[PDB]
Amino acid sequence: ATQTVTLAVPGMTCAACPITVKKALSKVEGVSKVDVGFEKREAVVTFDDTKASVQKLTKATADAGYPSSVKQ
């Protein structure tokens, strides 16, 4: 189903790895809405499999050093 929920974004204390995880979600396919940041370590976004998938987004995210995860 679509992906409109909270997402965990690694990096946290990374010099700025999560700063990318945010875009990573709204940058891959399925994007729709976004709310993520490295200021701490939280990736809230609303994307959807209409043209992508959760593993796809996170996969492309974990493939750039800054990944993500699902959360509620």
How many domains does the chain divide into?
1
Return the amino acid letter for 53.
S
The CA distance from 60 to 24, in Å, is 7
Phi, psi for residue 23 in degrees, rounded to 5: -50, -45
The CA distance from 70 to 22, in Å, is 13
Is 14 assigned a ligand-binding role in the annotation? Answer: yes
Tokens 């995210």 — which residue? 61
CATH number at residue 6: 3.30.70.100
**Structure solved using which method?**
NMR
Is 16 assigned a ligand-binding role in the annotation? Answer: no
Domain containing residue 7: 1-72
Q: Token pair of 60, please?
A: 């492309």
